Amino acid sequence: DDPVYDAEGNKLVNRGKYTIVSFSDGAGIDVVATGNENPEDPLSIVKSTRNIMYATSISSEDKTPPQPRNILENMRLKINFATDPHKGDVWSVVDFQPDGQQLKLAGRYPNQVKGAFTIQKGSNTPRTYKLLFCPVGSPCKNIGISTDPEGKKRLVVSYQSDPLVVKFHRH
Secondary structure (H helix, E strand, O other): OOEOEOOOOOEOEOOEEEEEEEOOOOOEEEEEOOOOOOOOOOOEEEEOOOOOOOOEEEEEOOOOOOOOOEOEOOOOEEEEEOOOOOOOOEEEEEEEOOOEEEEEEOOOOOOEEOEEEEEEEOOOOOOOEEEEEEEOOOOOEEEEEEEOOOOOEEEEEEOOOOEOEEEEEEO
């Protein structure tokens, strides 16, 4: 499969740090409390509405050596925050009642869905991609945005979600 390219046109490096940024508006990834969550202990991964853009390490899920030098499209991945305040926190999908499958920091909610993330070309515009979630033993779903009653742009997972198109900035 094709290697995924960063915004500068270089192949993504396996385990490298990149800043995922929304193509159409430049917003990055943020972690805030949504719903009944405590604002001092945010657990929701969202598209930022406050100019925050956290960097993430993107790694192949399979760690058996030799690991791929570059990230390829449709390759199973593990994504984790690379910097404070959530250094090392891993992205996970939680089948959140009654909202549905959404992205949350891993290890907090018990209802996590086993699976991995993958990347595919997101549009005709070069170096633009979309993220998918592929649960174990099930077809892959798109990752899109859903605005909650408080105005937070939650990252949700569904077959019908309009894919969030992003670019990867080397960080």
